[PDB]
Design a protein around this ligand. Sequence first.
Ligand code: HEM
Length: 406
Amino acid sequence: TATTPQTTDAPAFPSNRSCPYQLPDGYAQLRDTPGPLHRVTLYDGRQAWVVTKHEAARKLLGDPRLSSNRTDDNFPATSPAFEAVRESPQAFIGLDPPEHGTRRRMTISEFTVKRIKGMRPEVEEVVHGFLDEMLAAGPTADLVSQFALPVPSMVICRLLGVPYADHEFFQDASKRLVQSTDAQSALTARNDLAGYLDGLITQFQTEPGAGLVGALVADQLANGEIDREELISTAMLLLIAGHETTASMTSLSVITLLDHPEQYAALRADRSLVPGAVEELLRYLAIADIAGGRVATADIEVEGQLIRAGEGVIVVNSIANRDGTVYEDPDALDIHRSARHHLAFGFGVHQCLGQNLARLELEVILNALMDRVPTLRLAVPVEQLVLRPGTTIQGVNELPVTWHHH
Ligand code: HEM
């Protein structure tokens, strides 16, 4: 057996959070090591680079030599479940320019600033509606299943034209796909969603439909500008991202804010602080911190280190968002700080399409919780919560909460 010291200079990656709003111990070590890159070992033994510093993360996310093609054999897989993505058709998150832009531009009209503004009444109505139901249904609740997940789910379904009557099916399928640990169950969940979306496309070809899927069917698909399979992949990407990211931000923001009651109280006293607090929570919680997988298609020199063609690179935006040369005392939550330039949404051509919808949802949600349930508190200690592993979007699958009755 192994009878020698076990220290490595390529630690296992990813690591799991033990506290919802702090770096895993291994990530703090990576943050502290000088230099933009560090070697890591992925689940299957293959070595990869992680980017651990803020400016280098921007530079490398902007470098066209780091491809987003998940079907490349050398793309960095962080769990066996990734092989489902490598073997499946790709939405534009997995495309490089110029193909990336031709698909992304088919969807941007739904996510413009003007459109996001017009969505405020629907978002406020959805948030307060689910709040009405939860506040009436019990002294305690699971904030995730009763509030954090249904709210962004209903909103993105309206944007897409996906009927919410099927929400039990596709919410469950979304969860299985994002949170699966093995390739078979990820593949089944993708096929479940794909078959559902394919039937919706045929329905819209018979009776033109609402929302973005309706528009893609009536226009780009009818002109042959997007393949049917690509339309499915695109709708699936938007559906899942629209569900899972905002829901995780909501639950983790509640946990984090209740552990910083002085800042939560200041926020309640001055709602002009809510947009800045949302930016700080995005920086601090960085829930998609592994969404920056890339593969080099050519050699890239980075500050004396060399990324060789064919190596995998993961831009770890949670670590980059704790760069003390950008955010003073980076491990402190400070809703009054400038969290500008954070990487929670990435950077460059793939920067999050939904970022301003997410910012709107989280502002409405925080204002609604402070308005309607100012007495909200966790029903279990933080040490009893179960955090998702570092191989998926960060969050908690259950969040027991209570408040003052009626
Ligand atoms: C709530 C917090 C959210 C976070 C932290 C987040 C995070 C991210 C990140 C880091 C990326 C970059 C991926 C990469 O570089 O490979 C990304 C891309 C993307 N996100 Fe978000 N996201 C959020 C919400 C949303 C929402 C609500 C939607 C709604 C559809 C969405 C849709 C997308 C899409 C379509 C892309 C791919 C963009 C492209 O490849 O051009 N996201 N997201």
